[PDB]
Design a binder for this molecule. Structure first.
Ligand SMILES: OC[C@@H](O)[C@H](O)[C@@H](O)CO
Ligand SMILES: OC[C@@H](O)[C@H](O)[C@@H](O)CO
Ligand SMILES: OC[C@@H](O)[C@H](O)[C@@H](O)CO
Ligand SMILES: OC[C@@H](O)[C@H](O)[C@@H](O)CO
Ligand SMILES: [Mg+2]
Ligand SMILES: [Mg+2]
Ligand SMILES: [Mg+2]
Ligand SMILES: [Mg+2]
Lengths: 393, 393, 393, 393
């Protein structure tokens, strides 16, 4: 498996660029020049690169420097042909954002945070980004009395709707994608899972251009099924972007290589992204973005091995998932378990609630004890998937 | 603290009625007659009782028996004055529902499950229930390939919309409340948290009469902040009912007495139910339903002590939460931390996105380093709440 | 992959015999005759069968009944050739054990529980069992004030030393294996993890014949690394038995087929059982016992498929783990990463503490920043392992 | 509540000195001069101060610099009267320790790490410290194949026995306290929980002067009962020290003020430290050390308020726990529930195994169903405890 730009594999500048400082220690690697990053990613088969405003342009940088940095950055995009599909803003690193960007208790920080996002939408448009991600990493609290919970959501809505209306007013060809996270760095983050993110978007004025940017590790920190989560995002037509990585359990966010976390769940994620639904339905056609961090124990060879590893892992899984669905033993097992049977409507065309109630065969003369004898054979179906995954079928 | 019917404290028949069979052993207590239950609850100060169809009427019961059981049941309501504010259906105990009610892979079980719900709406209306709860406990899977995830949600929508349209057609004065649960008994349940529940309702045809029925322990099984969750349900105008209990961690669902789980979070839950939001906003005015189970180690004295305990716990907490908010030291601490400041809009009346961007004072001439020096004093604010909670202020 | 008795696959009678009742519902399968489990398991390739005293002999069995039942089970054993490597006691199902057996608060119950175990040692001995498992499932509490925690451990020790003393006294060739579990059925169980099990054994008078029976799902319920836990048990030479199953996260104990949980972790448990430690050390050599439950969704074909799936899962992993370590590329990766270098003593032959602090090369003139440049390439090594696991290598 | 040095409240220099940097952002506070921490903590009521070698003396300090810094810190100690009960080593911040100190894969690094500890023992000894803490934060792995798990424990043992041997050899009055932690900064840390810590100590040559330093948040990160864990450490007489803080769930280690986490659990830890075991047993008598971090949202008033909050939280809990056990109603509840009955041996004075199995009253004619009728009334006892905790009693 060798990735090619047609695979649509994008990487964030901060991923490979992650130097190793964790809470208990300092960087273990030297800074990675962004132009070096572009050249190396492009040679590995990457289609595009994403970044946070401050990943490329320092917070203090003068206008001269911004322009200098951008010019070299754009040259490298040109030299290689790497695209920039998604742009995001850093509203969490600087001490000013310690209580949040949009939901900062301080009004002057909320205005600063929002102006930072508005300027960043202009650079996104300029770069050719199709998606603008918003990860509200410091929106939340450690203590329950720190915030007025309704005001926190009024304030989150106000910023997202202001950013959304601004895209609409300039006619930028951009969608906003919100990224849910249960905790870390805040004790409790607002919009903690895919569900809260999706619900939130239905209360927005400009909801039509606001979707989600779910991350594997993030849902797994709440012990949720990532494939069930993305399935619901997809079903709602809100799966706008995706961040792929690995996590081994409910603990700090590990940010491992995709596939180095929960392997079986990674296989079913690849099956949904690549194959979609068994009865047919929506499909996710966007970039396959890897949002991970190369372990601080490894040197730069490990950084480039790690980036290669995301792509191979995904291609190995895809192959196994195409073999699995194409298998006639599997398709027949699927039939036995009712996968296709779930696809038929419960009610007959034209039947009503009154009709169903009063139909003796569906209720009053229904043999519940006979219907309960059905062997759904979910275990055997699950064993077929694992054997395809182990490359044994 | 002595509860009175004005406190609006409701109990499920299955709570006090829980005999003690867990996965590792059999009942430790004798069945509790429902008429005994009504009389005992009413003498403890309860306002109402709730039930699942099969809690009162056996699955096999003939029509004669149903009528016999209902007549005695209604007599007891009359004798005591206990109301029946919520009714629910058991779509999880019988072997026929082993793959689910509405999302059963088998079509004949989906029709049986839905007819069961439609008949149960009629009894709910007849009883005077204002809420019809739906806990899809067996909707989900253990294995990711068991279900077509999009079809599972089409099928859940079809049943909830069929039940919703039926209420509308008969003009019953009832709302449907969905109850999210991450897992148990299924490995992964569909609509696992408040967020997924709320999101789901926005895709329904009859969404206007569908809200939620969040449960303390259920959100805590995903390690979520219950007060943040209910705050978002409230903010959306979807907090239709509430199930209160305790849970100590991510583990099986314990169903302890409210307040015997995460005590500090219980205090902030009571503050939101009773006091609402600091800047003002929505309020939950429904019943305070306790959905717990008296520990299998205790005999019937423990059952009635446990039921008393829910009410006292809630009243103790309420008292402490009224003292806390009424305290001028607390109100001034609140002011210092920006609780009221979060209530002001980010943008000035009439200001636009373009206006804000270009306002030098909010961005280009904004001193980020000076604004980051602010002592939010969240720790001291949190210490004030705990001291009010410990009954020391 | 086809298991043969040489593989040592053992199954508990309660595993394939699990009926399907859980907290929210009744049994979905009819009881399994023990004769039939024996014959069936002999046909699939099982080496042995294990049981709890009440799996086989009812609580209330008369003497004549006990004899018939053992006559029937000994006949099956003789006819099939299956062995009985482990026997355990049910100190959790009867309502008498609602607060524990050995650590029950009631003294009369502690005495009955120990008497129930003593009698079971005799039976274990008559079956030709090598291991006697102790899973104290009801030993614990829901509430912190329910127990005197120092008295609970003296009571546990009393119990286990009385049982060990008796073994020695009767001259039985039986070792006791204690099975840790963090929670369920109690809120908190005593001796919650492998480490707590090992620690307790060292306070025992007859600790020489007492070791552990760690189970996969149990350790994963506290979020621990099951392979790290059994390596510590192995290292102290206390790994007497093992229970293999799958667990998908911190939640109720799922009891899935081995490998249907955390796959990579399963892969690495199989490497440690098959290959042992990279630098040499003790090796586990007892039964590979499966303590799982066929999902309640599945009918009896599912039951024998699930039994089979355990043994295939193990044989596919074993095939991969042996290929993994035989690969020259992997052996090279391991060396690079320092896996063999970890096996060399830190100190030199006859080097004292004073000698090493004195040595200037080791400390005072040690170049900490050049040593920190080593690329351990742990990511690459992990990628190699996963490629072997996926059968792409 | 006003703490006095008689209370034994000790604080680490790194606690109040924590600057605010985390994974997603930079420091929000300026460095704290150690002289100032000493004076400030003496003014709040602290009994002592603890530190890591590099909290005080920079990694790269010259000899002259080291002397100045110790002269400055000894002067502060002399001026304030504060003691130095514990000293620890930083084997996690330098990039050299990226794979561990003691269990690093690189042998040159293991040697430097142990040399770094030996030198620190001398310093500990010169400060008049009673305890030497060992927190192996970088000992572990992200990936299962990175380590030889039997070799990692031999390397750990080597390290800890070399340090213990040296203590004995120099005649220092110092005990080693090992501090378990399940994860963070590594994916999986070696000796993850109190039980694993205790187990390992028993494989040590010089285990007599090696015990534990359990921390509240660490045990809660695996979801364990912190009070049950320290009771097992106490029971084996291995509770040498303790680190108190708060943790709200299975997630990153939060380091909140003691009591700002799980309150009820905190209540019950304070009862065990203050009141000991209901039936008598060992009692903990060392420092009550706070290893927490003032939230990064708070400025320096917040820092001294947080230091204060730890000691008030402890004194409010202590006040409640002493009142709790003094209450005649509580003493009665405890007796009813069998808390004292658990403290009676199961067997009679000189009763053998054979004697008890023989006794017909204990087994053969034991009435299991009448014994099962006991109401343990654990719920009522829990309600009494929580009412004492809320100061309503
Ligand atoms: O937890 C970190 C988040 O994953 C970010 O990397 C977003 O994807 C971009 O701000
Ligand atoms: O987990 C069980 C659920 O809480 C139910 O009790 C619903 O509230 C009613 O079906
Ligand atoms: O959690 C259930 C346990 O795994 C038991 O089956 C033991 O293995 C033997 O009682
Ligand atoms: O997880 C961090 C630890 O608690 C440390 O502060 C130790 O207590 C000493 O290194
Ligand atoms: Mg991301
Ligand atoms: Mg409920
Ligand atoms: Mg087991
Ligand atoms: Mg600590």
């Amino acid at each position: 498996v060798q990735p090619t730009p047609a695979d649509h594999f994008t990487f964030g500048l901060w991923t490979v660029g992650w130097t190793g400082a964790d809470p208990f220690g300092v960087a273990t690697r030297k800074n990675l020049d962004p132009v070096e990053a572009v050249h190396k990613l492009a040679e590995l088969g990457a289609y595009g690169i994403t970044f946070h405003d401050n990943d490329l342009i320092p917070f203090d940088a003068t206008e001269a420097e911004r322009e200098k940095i951008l010019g070299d950055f754009n040259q490298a995009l040109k030299d290689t042909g790497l695209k920039v599909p998604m742009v995001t803003t850093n509203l969490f690193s600087h001490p000013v954002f310690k209580d949040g960007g949009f939901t900062s208790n301080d009004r002057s920080i909320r205005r600063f945070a929002l102006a930072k996002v508005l300027h960043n939408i202009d650079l996104a448009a300029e770069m050719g980004a199709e998606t603008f991600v918003m990860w509200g990493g410091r929106e939340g609290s450690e203590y329950d009395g720190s915030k007025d919970l309704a005001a926190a959501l009024d304030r989150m809505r106000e910023g997202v709707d202001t950013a959304a209306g601004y895209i609409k007013d300039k006619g930028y060809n951009l969608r906003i994608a919100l990224e849910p996270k249960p905790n870390e760095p805040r004790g409790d983050i607002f919009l903690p899972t895919v569900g809260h993110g999706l619900a939130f978007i239905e209360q927005l004025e400009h909801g039509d251009i606001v979707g989600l940017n779910p991350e594997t590790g993030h849902e797994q920190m709440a012990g949720l099924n990532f494939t069930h989560g993305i399935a619901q995002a997809l079903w709602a037509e809100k799966l706008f972007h995706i961040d792929l990585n690995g996590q081994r359990g409910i603990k700090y966010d590990q940010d491992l290589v995709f596939g180095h976390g929960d392997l079986t769940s990674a296989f079913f994620t690849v099956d949904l992204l690549e194959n979609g639904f068994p009865n047919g339905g929506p499909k996710y056609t966007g970039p396959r973005h890897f949002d991970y961090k190369p372990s601080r124990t490894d040197g730069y060879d490990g950084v480039w091995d790690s980036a290669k590893a995301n792509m191979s892992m995904y291609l190995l899984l895809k192959e196994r998932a195409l073999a699995f669905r194409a298998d006639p033993e599997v398709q027949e097992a699927m039939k036995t378990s009712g996968v296709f049977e779930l696809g038929e409507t419960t009610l007959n065309a034209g039947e009503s609630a009154a009709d169903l109630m009063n139909d003796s065969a569906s209720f009053a003369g229904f043999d519940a004890e006979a219907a309960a004898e059905r062997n759904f054979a979910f275990i055997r179906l699950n064993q077929l998937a694992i054997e395809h995954l182990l490359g044994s079928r």
